[PDB]
């Protein structure tokens, strides 16, 4: 099975393209999860911001199946998100300074490690191949799926692998597409 | 030839866009023997007749908890009506006289979500012939809770609590 955006694990207002690698946001924050999730190992995928008009925004990252599809990513204890506006990271809807923001034309990387035994999981974010530092440590245990959360008609494309435009140079990983 | 069916949805749309003129001839706010101010009936009202819409600010259903903790935290009031599993009518800051309708366990009106054009509206219909001067009333259908809002609808068979 191809790793794509989910057929039904999606907020219905979001516009998904036929090949299910593209999503346009509609109005308030809403989320779409991928078709596959991981629970052990190091995994990766990339997101390209196709178009980011003024006053639109994205929170991208990793979510658990129980994460709210009608709220932004990182609203819950089930998701962790990286907001284009100001580069803030989000979990349980608490915003903390993490990195610089991103915008239209950038390619973002998403690294997760869920080591086998206990091992300390982490989340690292990338902007155009550049490590932004550890975003989270020892996250809530469970299965994590790549998640997209868009606010107001911005368009983003997802790459699950196997080959990425900016493969990380400092970390070992498998592409999400291997799932 | 082609057999045609009667559309119930066409006259409902025609009835709704006359409601705003209809309700101002029909309803009024007075002091209630149930609680505070209540909406009353200013002219004989027939069964199935649309009384009024519960208009407000239509927010998504996910924003309810944050809204209630801001409302109940600031001590403002509930004034929220569920439209859907996706949409909720917040009449706390913006509404109409329909927010003065009280609850009963023995109501004379009922709430219904209907569709006109492409949107949904919460409209209150009369369950029976309602005479001029009666207090209009519907069943709030609050979710059941634990240790409790006392009800004062004053009719027998009253459930003793709003929830």
């Amino acid at each position: 099975s191809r790793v794509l955006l989910a057929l039904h694990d999606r907020a219905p207002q979001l516009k998904i393209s036929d090949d299910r690698l593209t999503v346009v946001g509609e109005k308030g924050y809403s989320m779409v999860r991928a078709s596959h999730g991981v629970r052990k190992g190091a995994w990766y995928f990339e997101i390209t911001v196709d178009e980011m008009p003024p006053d639109t925004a994205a929170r991208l990252g990793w979510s658990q199946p129980l994460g709210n599809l009608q709220a932004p990513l990182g609203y819950d204890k089930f998701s962790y998100s990286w907001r284009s506006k100001k580069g803030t990271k989000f979990h349980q809807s608490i915003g903390k300074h993490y990195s610089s923001g991103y915008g239209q034309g950038d390619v973002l990387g998403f690294y997760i490690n869920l080591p086998e035994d206990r091992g300390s999981s982490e989340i690292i974010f990338y902007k155009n191949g550049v490590n932004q530092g550890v975003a989270y440590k020892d996250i809530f245990e469970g299965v994590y799926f790549p998640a997209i959360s868009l606010y107001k008609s911005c368009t983003v494309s997802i790459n699950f692998g196997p080959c990425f435009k900016y493969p990380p140079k400092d970390l070992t990983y498998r592409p999400m597409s291997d799932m | 030839s082609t057999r045609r069916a009667t559309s119930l949805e066409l006259p409902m749309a025609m009835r709704f866009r006359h409601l705003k003129k209809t309700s101002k001839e029909a309803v009024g706010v007075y002091r209630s023997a149930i609680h505070g101010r209540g909406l009353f009936c200013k002219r004989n009202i027939d069964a199935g007749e649309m009384v009024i819409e519960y208009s407000g600010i239509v927010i998504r259903s996910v924003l309810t908890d944050k809204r209630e903790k801001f409302y109940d935290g600031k001590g403002i009031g509930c004034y929220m009506f569920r439209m859907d599993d996706f949409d909720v009518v917040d009449a706390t800051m913006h509404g109409n006289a329909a927010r003065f309708i009280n609850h009963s366990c023995e109501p004379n009106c009922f709430s219904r979500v209907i569709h006109v054009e492409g949107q949904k509206h919460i409209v209150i219909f009369a369950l029976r012939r309602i005479l001029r001067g009666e207090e209009l009333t519907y069943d709030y259908k609050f979710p059941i809770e634990d240790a409790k809002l006392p009800c004062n609808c004053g009719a027998k068979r009253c459930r003793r609590f709003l929830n």
Binding site: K27, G28, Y29, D55, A57, A71, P72, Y75, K85, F90, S93, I94, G95, Y151 | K20, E53, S55, G56, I57, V58, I59, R60, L63, K66, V89, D90, A91, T92, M93, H94, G95, N96, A97, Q119, H121
Partner: peptide
């Protein structure tokens, strides 16, 4: 409280879900 005529769709902002 201001009193409404029809329904008015709320227009969310980007920080609508965030704890300040």
């Amino acid at each position: 409280f201001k009193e409404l005529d029809e329904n008015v769709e709320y227009e969310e902002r980007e920080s609508e879900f965030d704890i300040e």
